């Protein structure tokens, strides 16, 4: 049994593809063998996304793994809902119930609302980035309209990299009009470091301030530069390094050759790479459940063109999504169980705070509690 899948990794994702290789080597079984067709194309240009999608469909695959940008979420959801082909992704969660889209990143907005209601805030600033949709912004505005908060919501992604020194100075000068002490940073692993460096340059990390790095990879950025400042920093972590399986994975991760695996010789790991390493396990467990249920969905590489009119679906793929909702395993993000839509249920997010000696867990967050 040879199962062919497709892959869409962005140009520049080295650690994610390295963890994908670690997951492909670690989770091989006897019942079958995966064969990914990897495409290293851009993620924002939707023409290249459509080309890679139709190239993966021309090979006749059963599932497609890969990321998607906020400018290409609708293309992925439409092309995977029409052709009824499952799509596994560690990217940001969508807004709605889109079929055949299985996602690896948990929700973040509910934990952030729980953290604000724990800290008992009333007036703060929300510096965000517009590269993962506007779901968290709409959530915090709809909660501020109900809880009577003073949210100063400012986007930061529209500022170019050539003149991002006076614009940030004018931004933090405008943030001193209301004497803002509380800032929530919702950015990815690249803009968080830049905003922290500009805060340290203008000198706003002394005791009296308070920051929240709103992401899942709280320890993925550099924390050694805002550790001895005095401004306490909270955040959310999905990979608990105190677990036994996480420690056994890091003990095999940090010893890897950097020339053989790019971006692997570190003591930590990004959250996207951990979700990729878990998604390989999820796909392997679902195909093993098909091998154990005696369900033959075998075909060949003659799926045809992606632009067929009318594009008739093949019904054995409809079971495959129903396969993926049956997966309930334990990986680097903790428990992995799914709903009827494709979201993640029954998970755990650590609420981290940065102390002098380092980060420290003050509690956990779930959805039933």
């Amino acid at each position: 049994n040879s199962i062919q899948i497709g892959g869409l990794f962005p140009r520049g994702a080295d650690q994610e593809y390295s963890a994908f290789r670690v997951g492909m080597v670690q989770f091989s079984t006897s019942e079958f063998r995966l064969t990914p067709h990897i495409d290293n194309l851009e993620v924002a240009n939707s023409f290249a996304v459509t080309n890679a999608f139709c190239s993966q469909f021309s090979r006749g695959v059963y599932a497609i793994f890969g990321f998607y940008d906020k400018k290409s979420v609708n293309t992925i959801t439409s092309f995977c809902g029409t052709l009824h082909v499952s799509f596994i992704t560690p990217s940001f969660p969508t807004d709605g119930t889109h079929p055949f889209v299985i996602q690896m990143r948990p929700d973040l907005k509910g934990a952030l609302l729980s953290l604000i209601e724990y800290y008992q805030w009333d007036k703060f600033a929300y510096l965000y980035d517009s590269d993962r949709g506007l779901s968290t912004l709409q959530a915090v505005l709809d909660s501020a309209a109900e809880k009577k908060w003073q949210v100063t919501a400012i986007n930061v992604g529209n500022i170019n990299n050539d003149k991002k020194d006076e614009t940030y100075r004018s931004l933090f000068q405008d943030l001193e009009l209301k004497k803002e002490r509380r800032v929530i940073l919702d950015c990815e692993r690249d803009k968080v470091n830049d905003i922290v460096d500009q805060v340290i340059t203008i000198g706003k990390h002394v005791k009296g301030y308070h920051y929240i790095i709103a992401n899942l990879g709280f320890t993925d950025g550099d924390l050694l530069k805002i550790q001895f400042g005095g401004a306490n920093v909270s955040g959310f972590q999905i990979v608990d390094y105190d677990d036994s399986l996480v420690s056994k994975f890091i003990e095999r991760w940090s010893t890897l050759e950097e020339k053989e695996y790019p971006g692997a010789h570190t003591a930590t790991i990004k959250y996207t790479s951990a979700l990729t390493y878990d998604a390989v396990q999820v796909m392997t467990e679902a195909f093993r459940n098909l091998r154990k249920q005696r369900i033959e969905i075998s075909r060949r590489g003659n799926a045809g063109d992606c632009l067929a009119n009318p594009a008739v679906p093949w019904g054995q793929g409809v079971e495959i999504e129903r396969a993926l909702k049956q997966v309930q395993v334990e990986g680097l993000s903790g428990n992995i169980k799914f709903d009827q839509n494709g979201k993640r249920i029954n998970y755990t997010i650590n609420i981290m705070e940065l102390k002098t000696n380092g980060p420290r867990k003050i509690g956990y967050w779930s959805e039933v509690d």
Partner: antibody
Amino acid sequence: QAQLKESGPGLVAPSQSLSITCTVSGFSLTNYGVHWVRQPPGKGLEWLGVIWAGGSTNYNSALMSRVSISKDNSKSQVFLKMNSLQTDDTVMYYCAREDYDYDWHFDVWGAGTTVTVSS
Amino acid sequence: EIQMTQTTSSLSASLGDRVTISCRASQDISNYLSWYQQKPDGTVKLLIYYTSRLHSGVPSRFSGSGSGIDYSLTINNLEQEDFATYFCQQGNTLPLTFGAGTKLELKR
């Protein structure tokens, strides 16, 4: 660099056991899988079996009930057991590591030892 | 199962010649094939991975191409260390069948 060498008895009797010891170096066998493959004289090289890095193992469809695999990660060695050897078992045997580089590839292989099964 | 084959069993070439080694399969392998070199001593080293890429440690004089069921390896200029046997190995469907392999020879 990565090297590997297979060793065995050289000569064995018919319908007996055959334990092959493969010593590999230059890497670690705790994070990669191992594959054992034979090579007959004047014929095509056929894959015999494989064992994963986690602990799963499979064999070829022709002689799955005759091949077995174990590993020693402390000495980085592989023990391949083959029983019910016939008169056509005068062939070479080799071991290799596996890797994923968008295809299941055999990265580092071994020299392989010759075994002549005769009474 | 999937059977690999090679028509050329013994090839003759000189020093500095672009040598081509072809390989055929029983069906479509989706370019999931590797080309490996094995010297006369018994040491087997991998040369080209996924039928188009070169692994870290091999020289840039070798290259690969092909599509469908027909693949090929092309050496731009042969050296003294290139006197070996080239073998094609497909890893699409288990049990993986390796090719028969050809033997390059020096012309004199």
